[PDB]
Symmetry: D6
Subunit: 163 residues, 12 copies
């Protein structure tokens, strides 16, 4: 019952990592080339794009994948050079993944709107801008949040048993 969950964690991790490496890289290719605003101003496309999407979805997910696999790198490299390390590494993984999930919800939310209203310099008054591919990016948002939730839950399976 409790033993197999490790199989589930490993498989969702590698799954999680190749959806994000083979699918996500090309939904987000033309983000800024196909982002258009309704103005004649130079430099308002750049301002309003950077205000709407300060850090892209896929950069945050790459960093979140790499950062929650660093504790394992420590646990491997300690073994090669040679259980108190084990529990520490597990609690640190749990803390990192919860912090990253809640930071995700607070950065992005649950949706990607199709319109944005922008009032940064050099734009005059407020302007309207149009996102390219909002429904696919919404589906990807919700899929990553669900997988993140599943691994949060399964990591919390192991915590209670030994702790």
């Amino acid at each position: 019952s409790t033993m197999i969950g490790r199989i589930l964690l490993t498989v969702v991790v590698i799954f999680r990592i190749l959806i994000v490496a083979i699918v996500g890289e090309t939904v987000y290719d033309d983000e800024q080339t196909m982002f258009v605003c309704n103005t004649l101003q130079p430099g308002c496309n750049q301002a309003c794009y950077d205000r709407a999407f300060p850090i892209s979805h896929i950069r945050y997910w790459v960093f979140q994948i790499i950062m929650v696999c660093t504790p394992s790198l420590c646990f491997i490299t300690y073994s090669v050079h040679q259980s108190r390390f084990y529990i520490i590494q597990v609690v640190f993984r749990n803390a990192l993944e919860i912090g990253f999930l809640v930071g995700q919800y607070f950065l992005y939310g649950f949706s990607v709107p199709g319109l944005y209203e922008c009032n940064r310099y050099p734009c005059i008054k407020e302007v309207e801008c149009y996102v390219s591919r909002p429904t696919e990016k919404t589906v990807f948002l919700v899929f990553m949040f669900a997988v993140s939730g599943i691994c949060v839950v399964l990591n919390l399976a192991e915590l209670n048993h030994l702790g």
Copy 2:
């Protein structure tokens, strides 16, 4: 008679997976760059493209390839760490592939039209938009539906024998 079908399933799976990795990625390269609508409105190209093609054909097929190979990943990883697992994994594969096939038919259908009629904001009244490469995408649709059907049938070969 019944024994060889496994050879056929494995070969159609790897076949299925490399047509989709070497051919499909570049029919769908210029989908949004070569999608044109008949208007002067900013932001109606984005709205009407995202309404016509909410999730691209090839993202659904990547996910369908990866998702129907996850049960095997569980069956391998259980064997390394060490028959009731076997039958469960087979029935889950069958259920997943049937659900994905019927979801495909209900998302996309059997054709890709050359014209689309769109009435989303910011577009004014209804507008006409023009798909790039509708015949090749139709041939690919029908080919994937046929291969999906073949593996559905051959998976259902094995179910009856043991079950």
Copy 3:
């Protein structure tokens, strides 16, 4: 005399497969970007391109390469799991390659014209469109038809001996 022909078949197959993987992919890169029609109509470039070239040359050749190597995949995978299989696989290869060659001649012919005359909707009356790179695509057509003919002939060498 008869024995060496297998060497010739294998070498023309791998030859055939790397000309098509290293040369063909970039003659056909800019096909639709550099296809131009003589009109002011939106959406007539897409219609007339898709009417002229319903399935690209190189997609048909990829599929023809992959499809005429699937019988060997069956013959290998049967041997790993463990002569009546042999002759069946050979006659199926022959039938597949002849069907694909004649289907090629009936799809494409022997030439690629430099002009095309098109009368699809949304185009008004008939229009004239201009193919990019017709001579190189003609040379590639004729080269693939000749190599296909050579392997058809050499496969038919083996049929008569055992059959």
Copy 4:
């Protein structure tokens, strides 16, 4: 206490090297295509871009990654051909990394502004130009400066013990 720090240095190094190889290459793809100035002058976009960003962020970081791993290449190649080499290589690594960090702060600083004011020939009087993606490049700047600081500190851990 002191022994494990080597694990931390190695892991931050490989970490540091793959964030920079998988993330950084595509924030900086469209830097000059999406850099716009407010003029009708030919050649003022080139002048003002090259004045604002004389050496890109990511070229400096590639060179800094490669240059602070060359002492290890010397220490490996000496061992294959066959402790005084060791301490020398460590002090040289420390000196190189401190020099590169302070040179970074003096080249770039801590921010990337969204506007630039430029008065190079051929531009007339002073002109205003607009950076694409200033917030993401700022986050990357600060992240690289923090990781550089961490490895500076941990290298200085080892110096005091033997020295």
Copy 5:
């Protein structure tokens, strides 16, 4: 004296093959995008480009590299399945390489002009068109002709000795 020449042939062959795989592919990237003619006619750029450069330089060199290495593939595959084969393969290599060299001189010549004069349909009367990068393509032409000559000469070294 005579023995070492084989070392020279092998090294010039691999040399010849990686200059052509790492350098040549990107001189010829923008050939048709940066080819411009002096007209307002649709479809005269395509006609005049295809008349000037019917088969690109680098496609001919790829085919010439692959075609003059096929005899060795026959000589290897015969050895695995198991001197009269040897001499035949050598004379065939010599004949192939001389035929390809002289065909090169008769297709392309020794120069790439910077201007071209074109009178194909749909162009009106004769028109003037402008080649992009003629000096680099000339240097590459002459370099490939010189290396081809060197291997022609060294192959003819071996012929006389045994023959």
Copy 6:
């Protein structure tokens, strides 16, 4: 003292080769797309670009890397088939690298100007053109000249000892 210099030569060679393979390829990507001249003439951009930069910086450096490693290829291939070869190969390497360095200085010099003055046909009288990225290309020029000098010096270390 004299023995270790070989370590330094090997490491600067591989260093030299990966700065040039990972950094240089993308400074020189948009050279001709972002090269602009001040005219309305068709075909003066092509003429003046090819007059300013007859052979790109990075093609010369690729060829210089490959050409000064061919003597080692001869020395390896002789050893496999089996000291007079050794000294010959060293003097040939020295001669090749000095010839390539001085040819570099005579082709390019020490700078890349930001303006160019051009009077080739089809341009009318003399025209002014604007280089993209002159400071980064200058830094790369000077870096390659310095590394070339270092290996020239260290090769000349070995010459005197045996000679």
Copy 7:
């Protein structure tokens, strides 16, 4: 009381005629140059302009001015060549002016909208078009209808007295 009304009719007539000759000609100058529709279709601007404004306001008013002064031309030319003519000419003037007023109301109405919805060939489905200067043309419409009403009333003053 009744006698002076003729003074009022003559003065409103000449008034009516010079507002229409000095003011009206240049409100209606740029009508078709500044009429814009929201499409990319050739020839939909012409179709939709001609459907919206089949006969311009000012052509109808010129014809109405000229046509209701022709009876006086008959009455003058009869007198030069030399009371039954008089009453006939008056009743004909009355009939003409009432017919022209009611025809005006039935052609144009009381307003000029700022938007028009158009579904003529070559336009696709229905389209939206934008009138230039709708408020000034509305003020002119209402002013001409009021003056027309005043002269209708004053002509009907004279009818009853003699009739």
Copy 8:
């Protein structure tokens, strides 16, 4: 009865002449600027405009006004220098006006279509072109034909009496 008709002829003549001098000149101002064809060909707008409208409506009407008033100029100038002249001048006026009316019907007809189909050189195959203001030009056509008919009839009133 018969005497007054001369009053009617004179008044319709001056009427006819000022509708044509004050109204007609500006319906036909932008005829060729606002005539558009559906092509990218240079010089097909000129060819197809000149094929559709070989002689403008208003040039024919100016000439018809001037030509049917020349007999009166002869009759006046004869009287100043000083009945057989009279009847001759009347029959010549009648013949001229009938010839001009029937020539009008045979040149232009009764309508102005909104579309024209054109196959003149330099146009490719047949093309579609769009007339500006077809309804107003139709109303003017029919009005001039009706007035021409009225004066034809009234001239034929006088012929029978004396003749």
Copy 9:
């Protein structure tokens, strides 16, 4: 003292009328061609121009010139057909000119701003538009208001004496 004021009224009237006929017509020529708004919307230039300037300055002044000279036309035409008429005509002129002056102040005010903020359909949110020639139109506004005031005052000179 009181007698000469009539000379002043007549001369300011003809003065007033030729400044407005020779100067004003061409300040207001390019009003709508040189009116620009900051948007990509079709039809927002028309909407926002017509909202900013519903009736042009010069149409109101033409009508005000013509309307305050109609009482004199009545007083002349009464005299030709033949003091109670006199005083009535004077009080009506006074009332008309005061009503027109105060209506002017309430329509236009005392300034013409260089910017306008507009939120009419089809414009999105509020937009900014730019008036051409605001200082010259301001000088003309103030000049016409001053001359109007002077004639108001001098007309009120005559009222008190007889009344």
Copy 10:
């Protein structure tokens, strides 16, 4: 018989002069704005227009009208200040009009072609240009040549009688 011809000369002269003043001025309005050539060259439109039409049709006809009425101006001004003058003036008129007619035929001919082939600097090789309104200008050419012929003939009527 001979006496009336003077009436015919005077009337054809004034006729000739008002067709040319009321019709001709606006066929030739847009001659150079609507003259298009098939090139991208600056300044080839100007060169080829000025080569095709060195002196416009209507300037030659204005000068021919004014120059053949100057002898009458001499004959009038001599009479005011106060038969040998008479005959001289008539023979000079005849000589002037014949010289102008034959000069017309030698300048222009009898047609206006729709295409022109031009090889002036700055044009490259020969180019094709397209005349606007060639049929109307042909009709005007032939009409002026016929009227010129008629007055030539009638002037030659008077010569023989007195001479």
Copy 11:
């Protein structure tokens, strides 16, 4: 001596008035269409044109012509209705013309520069703008100032004699 000066004043006045009515109106036709600034900003052309030329040269000269002829209109209209009026009118003319001349020098100066430097909103920092036809406008400025000076002097001739 003193008597003839009146002839000179009248002739310079009518001279002055027809140079300004026949020449000046078309130097100043394209002033704002051919005024260009070096920016991409909407609305900076309007701002900077109106800042450079607040009131056109020719409007000031029209007003100066009309205003210095109003005293004569008073002197005529007084004579019709019927020497103290005379001297008053002369001193008022003198005062008006001197005030207008010095106001001219203080508005415009003696030159029209070819460049203007502008820093009004919406322009960013300071911008450079280019005047069309500065030398002709300078010649006209100096000519009007000289003629104004001549009439100032000759008016001052008459003042001293009677005064």
Copy 12:
């Protein structure tokens, strides 16, 4: 002999004045709109046009017509208010016309070139610009110089007789 020359002077004067008022005004209409230079610089068209044609041909001829008729205005106005005036006026006319003719030759010369070479700021180095209509302007130049010469000669006829 000597008496009639006055007839010739008067007629050439009025002739001279109406060729220049009816023909010249529209050769010089599009001078600056159809003047094109070969650059991308803003403001180089204005600079180079104003350098090439500082004062237009037709402004100089208007001023020369008006200035050589002012002495007659003096001679008329002296006669109305009432032989020493006569001779003075004649010598002044002669001096004015000779000065204007030689000033013409020194301003303009005898030709109008089709190309101009310009090196004014803001133009970069020297540029080439293209005159519109050089042959017609040359014919007009030579015609005005010939007529000017004729009146110079005939004025000099009268000088000698009385003087």
